[PDB]
Ligand binder design. Structure first.
Ligand SMILES: C#CCN(Cc1ccc2[nH]c(N)nc(=O)c2c1)c1ccc(C(=O)N[C@@H](CCC(=O)O)C(=O)O)cc1
Ligand SMILES: C#CCN(Cc1ccc2[nH]c(N)nc(=O)c2c1)c1ccc(C(=O)N[C@@H](CCC(=O)O)C(=O)O)cc1
Ligand SMILES: *c1cc(=O)[nH]c(=O)n1[C@H]1C[C@H](O)[C@@H](COP(=O)(O)O)O1
Ligand SMILES: *c1cc(=O)[nH]c(=O)n1[C@H]1C[C@H](O)[C@@H](COP(=O)(O)O)O1
Lengths: 264, 264
């Protein structure tokens, strides 16, 4: 996508060499924002083939409040394997915080349900937020939440959403993060009878790993193809009842995939 | 400031009329980002006179982990009066979450201290964050955190910080929020022996209240004056030992102040 390729180029041009937790090394910039008008098409990277199966199942997995990779394995999705323990657990990551944020007084808060109620009863609220950054449980998490905080907004019958991603692996992670959230917006909009608005992506430490340079140069030589259309065949009873089969991406003709090692 | 006046104009030009919690009405946009190179000067609005006393004391108050307006009254700062209860309490807002985030298991986490340790022992960390959005305690808060989540970044010996502000009152609140955080960055940089980098401000629902239109038009007719210089006279033992007297803003010659009613 145009916005995506411009960001890659921006990092190569303005990125500062920086060491990182994985010991891989990166070219990094801090603070970037881009916007995707969901009405223009589904923001799925076309300059390289993205594995839809992984993207979709990861989101449904988050929505189930699941943090054990079992569900993913049942569906042949292995994207989280390297961080799970012997029992396949990742700790109280995304799913757990979204569906059951533990309070100091023993209660559990379902942020998704709360969000649905706010969208349906108070669309003008400036507090329609979901946060995975649970300070009191970070030490139990296998990997601190990258996409950590998002907010919904409703204007002119359209639903928008802004995601704050503290750390962004531009080559491997970003394509997944963008598509994933664009999907959630469509789902939320469907459940709330709203049109899709904009997906605003805001990043903190946005970087390209040193061992993704050839991949990056290769991808930058490609021309972006028309964005596909997302078709949701059915309207489930709730946001928690979607199935992989309910989604259709029409007209997705990407360039060939590009393999790149993941920094653990 | 140029960035600030451009945002005001942007809201007037692209803002959508929207109702809000206060019943005042606003012109609103969603998703905006601006950057201030702290090396260029202290980002204090010059097109209208800002009350430094309030700004500074509010930050020191946050740092003490205080949430009762008593300290503010002792110092003649009344900016939070309308939301405090009979006993002057505001609930577990900013100060409390920064200094004593309550965990489910009874512990309390000092995020500022944690941040200092990360900056000093692991400056390359992509997880140097402080969050005031405590989902489990929002119901006890007098007003949900506007400036809710910020992240520090270190590159080339310089300290940067990005703030995610979910809701922004462009006329009254923004000047305070920008100056306040720019100050915290200088303080943090001093304590960590780093140069100041950039302050990246990212907003969610960014708006102008309907009853601030005349004020806005008046301010937009003014020319921004050179930014002042922040001088920190002393280097305290810790980030928690600063005093109002330690700060000096050199060359602050603003246009006259503009009164505007606050939406409760
Ligand atoms: C974001 C996110 C979720 N995640 C989780 C996740 C966890 C740790 C991370 N760590 C690093 N260094 N970068 C990441 O983007 C990252 C992502 C992903 C993990 C792996 C792939 C990945 O390797 N994708 C391959 C597809 C391989 C497959 O089909 O299994 C690709 O080529 O895109 C994508 C997303
Ligand atoms: C941000 C923030 C902190 N806060 C707290 C705070 C709480 C609720 C809010 N609610 C609304 N509608 N807008 C706000 O910006 C806002 C800000 C502030 C509160 C008041 C003023 C204010 O009235 N300022 C006057 C100065 C008056 C004085 O000296 O006491 C001004 O003209 O700027 C500024 C900041
Ligand atoms: C984390 C998972 C995700 O959803 N998207 C991402 O891009 N990532 C990336 C960020 C970073 O490269 C690495 C996590 O490392 P760190 O915690 O930031 O040090 O995975
Ligand atoms: C809140 C306090 C602050 O630090 N800065 C701000 O601009 N505000 C504003 C945002 C909004 O106008 C109002 C809070 O209302 P709401 O919770 O967003 O409905 O004060």
């Amino acid at each position: 996508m145009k916005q995506y390729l411009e960001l890659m180029q921006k990092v190569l041009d303005e990125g500062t060499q920086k060491n990182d937790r994985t010991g891989t090394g990166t070219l990094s910039i801090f603070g970037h924002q881009m916007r995707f008008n969901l009405q223009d098409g589904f923001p799925l990277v076309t300059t390289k083939r993205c594995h839809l199966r992984s993207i979709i199942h990861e989101l449904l997995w988050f929505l189930q409040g699941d943090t054990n990779i079992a569900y993913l394995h049942e569906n042949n999705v292995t994207i989280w394997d390297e961080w799970a323990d012997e029992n396949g657990d990742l700790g109280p990551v995304y799913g757990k915080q979204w569906r059951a944020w533990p309070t100091p007084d023993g209660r559990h808060i379902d942020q998704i349900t709360t969000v649905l109620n706010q969208l349906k009863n108070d669309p003008d609220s400036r507090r329609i937020i979901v946060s995975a950054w649970n300070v009191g449980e970070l030490d139990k998490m296998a990997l601190a939440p990258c996409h950590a905080f998002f907010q919904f907004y409703v204007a002119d019958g359209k639903l928008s959403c802004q995601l704050y991603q503290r750390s962004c692996d531009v080559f491997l992670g970003l394509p997944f993060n963008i598509a994933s959230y664009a999907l959630l917006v469509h789902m939320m909009a469907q459940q709330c009878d709203l049109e899709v608005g904009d997906f605003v992506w805001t990043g903190g430490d946005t970087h390209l790993y040193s061992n993704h340079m050839d991949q990056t140069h290769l991808q930058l030589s490609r021309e972006p193809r028309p964005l596909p259309k997302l078709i949701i065949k059915r309207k489930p009873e709730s946001i928690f009842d979607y199935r992989f089969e309910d989604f259709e991406i029409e007209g997705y003709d990407p360039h060939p995939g590009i393999k790149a090692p993941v920094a653990i």
